[PDB]
């Protein structure tokens, strides 16, 4: 810790210090107007985290909408800010 850098007890981190969840959300629209426009996401044929919640709804126009929230676990790393 010559300049403003810092030494952090490693084992202390492992015991929980400064652990942080990190949720991110993705959203997509099934398709545009029903005016002869077609597209969907029914597993068509041919970052890091896990799926937490998957929410499917529709706009006031009746177009189906999907929102996906994924989450991960930040574990303090060398170089972070404090």
């Amino acid at each position: 810790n010559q300049e403003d850098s810092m030494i952090m007890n490693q084992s202390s981190i492992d015991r929980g210090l400064f652990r942080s969840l990190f949720f991110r959300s993705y959203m997509d629209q099934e398709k545009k107007y029903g005016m002869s426009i077609t597209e969907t996401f029914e597993k068509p044929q041919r970052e890091n985290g896990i799926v937490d919640q998957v929410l499917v709804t529709t706009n006031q126009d009746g177009l189906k909408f999907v929102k996906v929230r994924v989450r991960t676990t930040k574990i303090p790393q060398i170089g972070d800010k404090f």
């Binding site: 799926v51 919640q53 998957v54 929410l55 499917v56 709804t57």
Partner: peptide, 30 residues
Amino acid sequence: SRTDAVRCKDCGHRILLKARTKRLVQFEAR
């Protein structure tokens, strides 16, 4: 499934919550 709209049959909402996967999830405690 498809063509079933998004109305809740008992609540009438437009909110669906994906049924959680039945597969098991592995975590390394640390």
